[PDB]
Amino acid sequence: SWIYPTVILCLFGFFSMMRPSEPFLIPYLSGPDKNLTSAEITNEIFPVWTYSYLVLLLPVFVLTDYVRYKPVIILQGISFIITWLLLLFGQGVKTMQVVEFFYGMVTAAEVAYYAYIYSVVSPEHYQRVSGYCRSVTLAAYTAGSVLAQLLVSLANMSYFYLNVISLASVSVAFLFSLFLPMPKKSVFVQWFQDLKECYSSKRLFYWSLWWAFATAGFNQVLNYVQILWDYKAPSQDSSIYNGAVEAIATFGGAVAAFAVGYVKVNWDLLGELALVVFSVVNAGSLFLMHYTANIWACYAGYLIFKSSYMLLITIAVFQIAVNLNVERYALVFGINTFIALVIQTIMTVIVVDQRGLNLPVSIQFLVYGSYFAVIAGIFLMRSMYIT
Numbered sequence: 001s002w003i004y005p006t007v008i009l010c011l012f013g014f015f016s017m018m019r020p021s022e023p024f025l026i027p028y029l030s031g032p033d034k035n036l037t038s039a040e041i042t043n044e045i046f047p048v049w050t051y052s053y054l055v056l057l058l059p060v061f062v063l064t065d066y067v068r069y070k071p072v073i074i075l076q077g078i079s080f081i082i083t084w085l086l087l088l089f090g091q092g093v094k095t096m097q098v099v100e101f102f103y104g105m106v107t108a109a110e111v112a113y114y115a116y117i118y119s120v121v122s123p124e125h126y127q128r129v130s131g132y133c134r135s136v137t138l139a140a141y142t143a144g145s146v147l148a149q150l151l152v153s154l155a156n157m158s159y160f161y162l163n164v165i166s167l168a169s170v171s172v173a174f175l176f177s178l179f180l181p182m183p184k185k186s187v188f189v190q191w192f193q194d195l196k197e198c199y200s201s202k203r204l205f206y207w208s209l210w211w212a213f214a215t216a217g218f219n220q221v222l223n224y225v226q227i228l229w230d231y232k233a234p235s236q237d238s239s240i241y242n243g244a245v246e247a248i249a250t251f252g253g254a255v256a257a258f259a260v261g262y263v264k265v266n267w268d269l270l271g272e273l274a275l276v277v278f279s280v281v282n283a284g285s286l287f288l289m290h291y292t293a294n295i296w297a298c299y300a301g302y303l304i305f306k307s308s309y310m311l312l313i314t315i316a317v318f319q320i321a322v323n324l325n326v327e328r329y330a331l332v333f334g335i336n337t338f339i340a341l342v343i344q345t346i347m348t349v350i351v352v353d354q355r356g357l358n359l360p361v362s363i364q365f366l367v368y369g370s371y372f373a374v375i376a377g378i379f380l381m382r383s384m385y386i387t
């Protein structure tokens with residue numbers, strides 16, 4: 001039944017995201033072992049991830065369905081071993097740009113990871129599995145963060161051994177990906193015409209329109225929420241309080257994702273109302289983050305925002321999967337992720353890039369809340385227009 005592929009994919013997505021080195025990547029990179037600097041990390045290393053993410057998304061979303069979703073998952077596994085082997089034994093900027101290239105491979109193939117299970121189970125489970133998948137990944141993340149925040153503070157574990165544990169985790173995920181069951185088989189304008197037949201599905205260009213625009217703002221909030229927290233209450237101890245909050249904000253999101261899989265609720269006839277309710281919830285949380293000068297209220301707002309967004313994106317992925325009616329599971333997921341990344345890049349050029357408006361983080365989250373309020377009102381007025 002659905003149990004075996006779902007369990008194997010959940011194990012892969014757990015051990016491939018249970019990465020203790022993620023919260024402490026910068027202290028690892030800028031430190032006594034790697035010996036990098038904050039200039040070479042944010043200007044010569046980090047943008048390589050974005051560039052590699054866009055271009056590797058290009059073949060990822062074109063060719064994933066054709067190769068039946070397993071080799072890209074296996075390619076993600078091999079990229080995990082290469083990325084962390086180079087992180088473990090890499091020196092100089094040149095090697096870390098290769099690390100960023102392979103992490104772009106990993107992040108692009110996450111799209112294949114999310115679509116493989118849809119390619120392998122019956123549509124009747126497409127809801128349950130959906131939540132489970134998202135849930136375990138988020139769970140993995142918080143576990144990793146916890147296994148970080150515990151170890152470094154209760155075993156004096158150097159970041160080198162954190163990355164060793166991370167490599168051990170992602171290598172076992174490679175073995176789990178090796179055991180994934182293989183899904184069964186089945187000019188330029190023609191492809192586009194097929195795309196025209198793929199995005200014409202019922203309520204799938206609408207959920208796609210939410211996915212393309214909402215997750216761009218979500219990634220912007222993810223990137224700059226740490227800066228907002230540092231601006232709100234600049235303290236030397238916040239390093240142990242920021243990530244932990246995210247460790248309890250991702251976990252809550254996991255629960256929200258687990259809400260989609262577990263409960264049996266007809267989403268087809270209620271997905272629009274849930275979409276508008278949780279979109280205005282995201283907007284209200286983001287305005288709650290910006291307006292209140294209290295770090296605890298801001299933490300609660302971030303938790304609410306992350307949980308509601310994770311619930312909404314789980315619903316979006318499930319609703320796209322059921323309504324797709326074509327095998328191009330990763331084509332829609334990949335194109336949605338690529339468009340979301342393009343929108344996020346354009347917005348980060350406009351709002352925070354020094355060549356644009358150069359808005360500080362005080363107004364950064366006001367702009368993000370306004371962006372999400374526009375998303376909600378566009379989607380809320382659509383429901384009224386239909387009725």
Ligand SMILES: Cc1cnc(Nc2ccc(OCCN3CCCC3)cc2)nc1Nc1cccc(S(=O)(=O)NC(C)(C)C)c1
Pocket residue numbers: 022025045046047049050099100103222223224
């Ligand atoms: C293991 C690893 C390898 N290479 C990188 N390169 C990289 C590091 C930071 C990046 O963010 C872009 C720059 N922004 C960072 C903050 C302000 C600007 C983009 C790419 N990051 C890595 N870790 C990492 C850094 C940020 C987010 C994540 S995540 O997968 O867990 N995604 C989040 C949910 C945390 C947003 C993981």
